[PDB]
Structure formats: structure tokens, C-alpha cells
Amino acid sequence: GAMDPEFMKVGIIGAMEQEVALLRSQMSNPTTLQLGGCEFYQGTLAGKEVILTRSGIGKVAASVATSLLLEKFAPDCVINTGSAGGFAQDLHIGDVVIASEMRFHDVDVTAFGYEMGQMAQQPAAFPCDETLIAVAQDCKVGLICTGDQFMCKPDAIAKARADFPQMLAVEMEGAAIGQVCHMFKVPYLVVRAMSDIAGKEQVESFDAFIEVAGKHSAEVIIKMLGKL
Amino acid sequence: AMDPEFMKVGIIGAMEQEVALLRSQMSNPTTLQLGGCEFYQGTLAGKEVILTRSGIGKVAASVATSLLLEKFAPDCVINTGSAGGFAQDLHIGDVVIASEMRFHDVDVTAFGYEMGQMAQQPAAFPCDETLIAVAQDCKVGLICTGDQFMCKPDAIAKARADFPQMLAVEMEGAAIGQVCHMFKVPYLVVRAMSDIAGKEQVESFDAFIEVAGKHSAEVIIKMLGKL
Ligand SMILES: Nc1ncnc2[nH]cnc12
Numbered sequence A: 001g002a003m004d005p006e007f008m009k010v011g012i013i014g015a016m017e018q019e020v021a022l023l024r025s026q027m028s029n030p031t032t033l034q035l036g037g038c039e040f041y042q043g044t045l046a047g048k049e050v051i052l053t054r055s056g057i058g059k060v061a062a063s064v065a066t067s068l069l070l071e072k073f074a075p076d077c078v079i080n081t082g083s084a085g086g087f088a089q090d091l092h093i094g095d096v097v098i099a100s101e102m103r104f105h106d107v108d109v110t111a112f113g114y115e116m117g118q119m120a121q122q123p124a125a126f127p128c129d130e131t132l133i134a135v136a137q138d139c140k141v142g143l144i145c146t147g148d149q150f151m152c153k154p155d156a157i158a159k160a161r162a163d164f165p166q167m168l169a170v171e172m173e174g175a176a177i178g179q180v181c182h183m184f185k186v187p188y189l190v191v192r193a194m195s196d197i198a199g200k201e202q203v204e205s206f207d208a209f210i211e212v213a214g215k216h217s218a219e220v221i222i223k224m225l226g227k228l
Numbered sequence B: 001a002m003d004p005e006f007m008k009v010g011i012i013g014a015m016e017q018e019v020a021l022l023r024s025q026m027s028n029p030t031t032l033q034l035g036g037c038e039f040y041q042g043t044l045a046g047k048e049v050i051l052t053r054s055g056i057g058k059v060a061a062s063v064a065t066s067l068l069l070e071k072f073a074p075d076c077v078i079n080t081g082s083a084g085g086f087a088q089d090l091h092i093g094d095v096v097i098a099s100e101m102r103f104h105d106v107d108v109t110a111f112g113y114e115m116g117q118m119a120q121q122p123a124a125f126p127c128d129e130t131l132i133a134v135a136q137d138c139k140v141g142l143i144c145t146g147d148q149f150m151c152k153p154d155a156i157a158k159a160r161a162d163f164p165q166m167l168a169v170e171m172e173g174a175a176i177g178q179v180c181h182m183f184k185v186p187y188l189v190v191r192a193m194s195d196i197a198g199k200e201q202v203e204s205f206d207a208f209i210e211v212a213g214k215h216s217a218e219v220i221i222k223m224l225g226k227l
């Protein structure tokens, strides 16, 4: 809207090909840069200058990709798109969650008095940018947690639910992207779509619906770009 | 020559206590602040080095290592610092040279990967065999990495059962190894023990982090004379 800040160069990150393929196919003559085991596609998409990033899976790869995206291309914000596992009551496959904030669910330095999920020298949560959140809303909103585990065992899900009763979904990169953006002081947002639901044949669900999750998340991003 | 030479050496430590001696023996270092990390360039014990203060944990170490590699392109990366000891005959102040790094907290085994193996990565990140030999001339084996301070009994027991040959744990080594794998750069992790599994690890850590970080860094300084 008129009173909102502007974002002239948009960085977009997805972990897997299934999460970036559609977005890439809608870019105009994209340049490709291979670096650090990641890929960066530079060009125009839905009327915006963007750098689309295929990061690889997990906290470390996401961190590499985001570091290089920021240091080499300096976008004005970062949007993470992709798939996630649903925890909240009324989530179904393909449903979209917009993160108001990211936390790590597997970080534990509580022995030194940090909150569960809080990394030393870091805030306990990484809030997504107030403008980006509202733009996504205009196109559920809440906490998504990140960890380097694919969560499908009853004990793991129960513990995560106990540590984070308000967690709506789980995935493997969003809070790493948020921490890197915090360290560079760059606005970010995470949008994810459910490829599987906690407790419900999650391996087979993920294999079957990763592509529809990646698609629904990417469609949201395309509409967001239309409004930035 | 035909010698296995590393001309520009990256060195990375998580905390001020792990890098302070190294920096203090550098000849008029230049300082750069980027991505929440610090990079000091200069000469040290005769060698061209970039010393990096990364911060704690996998994400911070990954940022630090990826910036170090892309902006400075060292010929090898050596990680130094403190760790928690699991091996039977390990004690406060003992040094461990990593043969390879693994993650103890990564679990995508539902998709067929080994325990500790992240999807799209190798199960383990072997340290460069030349760097290992140099370090030895100045225990050798597996160190595991996770984003947790391992002191609760059930967590120590799970890690021991998952990785029976794990000698020690810390919070950055395998991330550094993964980034170096992603960039194809040789690396090595060297740690000194600030605490031992099962033995008042919080108080031990606070009391021994300074001297353990110094001990590890002193190995590194020895190494740089022979590289
Ligand atoms: N169940 C799950 N756990 C972790 N990351 C996921 N991404 C999609 N589904 C997931």
C-alpha cells in the first residue's frame, strides 16, 4: 500500500527443485550462477527484479545459500518458499502457512539459561517482516519451527509439541534463513505449504505431494510479487 | 615446489576465547565486519592467514565459512576451539584431532540416509589427510556436531549409541566441514576438551573454556610453522 516500504530487489529461496521450478519457468531469460553448491537465477519475475535461489536441504545448506545471496546480490528482502509438515489441528495437505516468526525446535543450550530453541548469542525467535507478512495475507499465520530432522516418529512429534504448543508446522530451513537475515539485518518472510501432516503416513505423503506443496507456496509468492 | 603447500590459511573459531591468542600474534591485522562475523587478515607465524570469529552453532559457522571461502579463497580451513569429551580415556585439556566430522543431531533416516547424514550430503566429512599428519607431528578420530550443549544423561546415551566411535562433541565442526565440502576446500578440526560427558559440564565449561581454547590455538600455531 501507499504507506508501506518498498522492496525493489527480491530474493527468493527454495530448498528443492520441486520448490523453485515453477518460479524459475516464469522468469524472463534468467542468468544462472553456480556457486558453493547452490544455484542462483537472476532476472525479472512478475514485474520484479529477483534472484531465485535453490539452496539445498537443511540448516547448513540454507545458511550457505542465504549468505551468498545476500553478500553477492544484496536483495532488499528474502522470501523462503516450499513445503512443510503440518502440526496444527485443521491443516490439510496443500494448505499454506505464513510464518509470523521462526524458531528452531532442535536447538538446546538451555543448560546456560537460554530459552528452548534459542541459539547462544541469538534471539529466541526471528520475526518475519511486518510488511511482507501483510502482503502474503493480502494474497493461517503463526509460528513455524525448523530442525535438521524429518519429523514423523510419535516421540519426536510429542516432544516438539510440548516444547512449542503454538507451532503450526515444521520444516528444515526457515529459521536458518531467518537467523542469517538477522545477522545481515535484512527483512525476510517464510511461506510454506503442507506436504504431509504429523502422524499420517508422512514419508509416502511427502513423496506424493511435495510437488503440490511447492506449487501452492510458489503461487502465493507469485501473487506477492505482483503486489510489491 | 612439489610440496603439499597451503599458501593462504583460513582459521575459524567460534568464540573470542578460541581466537584471541591467534589474533594477538598476528602482525597488524586488518579487521572486517560482515554478516555478523569478523575476519582478520594478516601474517601469523610466517603464514598468510584469515582468522575468523564465527559465533556459536551450525548456522553461524556456516555463514562464517561461506563468507571466508567466497571472499578470501584460502587454500585450507582449520577450525580450532573447545569440545566435550565422550572417549573413555579423555580428560580436561586433552586435544582431539578429527579424522572426520559427522552431525549427531541430523536425522532423515526415514528417507534411507544414514543416521547423521543430511539429505544431499555425504554421511561424513573426512578431514584432509595432510592436515591431519601435520597436526599429529605437533588422539585422532571422530568428532560429532550438533546444535545442543550435551550434558543431560539421556542425550549423552542416545549419542553414544548412535555413534559408538564418537570421541567428542561440539557445535560447529561438521557445519564447517559441510561448507568446505560444498566448496571443495580441504579442512581440519582440532579441539581441546573443556568438559567431559557426565561430569559437571556447565561449571567445567565455564572454568576451562579459556585454557582449552588457548591449548587448541597453540596446536594451530605450531601447525602453521610446518605448512
Ligand atoms: N515432516 C517434516 N519434517 C521436516 N521437514 C519437513 N518438510 C516437509 N515435511 C517435513
Ligand SMILES: Nc1ncnc2[nH]cnc12
Pocket: B082, B083, B084, B085, B148, B149, B150, B151, B169, B170, B171, B194, B195, B201, B205
Ligand atoms: N558438552 C559440550 N557439548 C557441546 N558443545 C560443547 N563444546 C564444549 N563442550 C561441549
